[PDB]
């Protein structure tokens, strides 16, 4: 299986390429990468339109990034389980919506 950390780099270099050479537009897209390795456990990255990419252990992108992240920083805890994380995601999601309640 491919490492995540490499695969991310190939996308970012390509984005970077278009704005240096070719006269092209860059792509207007951010990815949040969710992948697994047995050299690192779970890895989670994000790449963005400048060709810069970073690792995060929790991340938000899109509308109201700042606000979501602020809530995320408090509710985060070193101890984890998936079902606990499912609750965490949803509590936050409800409070970042630009429309009333949540569905």
């Amino acid at each position: 299986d491919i490492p995540v950390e490499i695969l991310v780099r190939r996308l970012s270099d390509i984005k970077q390429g278009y704005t240096q050479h070719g006269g092209l537009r860059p792509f207007g897209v951010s990815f949040i990468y969710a992948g697994y390795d047995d050299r690192y456990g779970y890895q989670l990255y994000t790449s963005n339109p400048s060709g810069n990419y970073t690792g995060w252990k929790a991340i938000s992108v899109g509308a109201n990034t700042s606000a979501a992240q602020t809530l995320l920083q408090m509710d985060y805890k070193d101890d984890m389980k998936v079902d606990d994380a499912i609750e965490l995601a949803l509590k936050t999601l409800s409070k970042t919506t630009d429309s009333s309640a949540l569905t």
Partner: protein, 242 residues
């Protein structure tokens, strides 16, 4: 195909793209380099606007060309990656053909050369990053620190800093280094690097990163406690009275 120009010669004499490149270095990271008689230390401050990161699945700011050659940067991540990719191919290529790892000087010429070339052709414009290239030649023990900038110029320096708030730390080096004595004590070379970054980082002593390169594939990241120990020591110096 395409080959319309993006480099256009300035009536300054200093091209537009070179001058706007240098700005990119100031916004970016901070990197500093100190040479010993036996070491070359490369210090970087971490600035995380918010941190939800780990430090082990983030890409680290001192990047290996080789087991015993590092390259350190200030500027944009994106650009620097390209410079790194080309250098890892060049590392191997000398190793294949001369039967010996790179000299540091040739590699420095190489990183400069790609930058210089993108200033000279159309259709390409040059990279937004200045670098610190350091390492050791085959059968050698004497540190090499060179500084390369997007103009494609390079030169050797016994101490240097680049990136954000270069001025303050340059001065700080002018009054805290000796040219009749580069320190031959690994501890005082790390010490100086920690003093330099301390004065800028604002808070946090695990938002300081040291990378030490000693001869013969000895690249070592010193750990949290060791770093704390110099910081304690710097407040004893600052709250000294007779």
């Amino acid at each position: 195909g395409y080959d319309r120009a993006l480099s256009i010669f300035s009536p300054d004499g200093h091209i537009f793209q070179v001058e706007y490149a240098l700005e990119a270095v100031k916004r970016g990271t901070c990197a500093v380099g100190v040479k010993g008689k036996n070491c070359v230390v490369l210090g970087c401050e971490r600035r995380s606007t918010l941190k939800l990161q780990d430090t082990r699945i983030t890409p680290s700011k001192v990047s290996k060309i080789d087991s015993h050659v590092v390259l350190s940067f200030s500027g944009l991540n994106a650009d620097s990656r390209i410079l790194i990719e080309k250098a890892r191919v060049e590392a191997q290529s000398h190793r294949l053909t001369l039967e010996d790892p790179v000299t540091v000087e040739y590699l420095t010429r190489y990183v400069a050369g790609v930058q210089q070339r993108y200033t000279q052709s159309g259709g390409v414009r040059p990279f937004g990053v200045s670098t610190l290239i350091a390492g050791f030649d085959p059968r050698d023990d004497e540190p090499k620190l060179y500084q390369t900038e997007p103009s494609g110029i390079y030169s050797s320096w016994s101490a240097q800093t680049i990136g954000r708030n270069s001025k303050t730390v340059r001065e700080f080096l002018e009054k805290n280094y000796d040219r009749k004595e580069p320190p031959a004590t690994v501890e005082e070379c790390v010490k100086l690097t920690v003093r330099s970054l301390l004065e800028v980082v604002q808070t946090g002593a695990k938002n300081i990163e040291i990378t030490v390169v000693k001869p013969d594939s000895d690249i070592v990241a010193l750990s949290s406690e060791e770093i704390n120990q110099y910081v304690t020591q710097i407040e004893q110096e600052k709250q000294e009275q007779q």
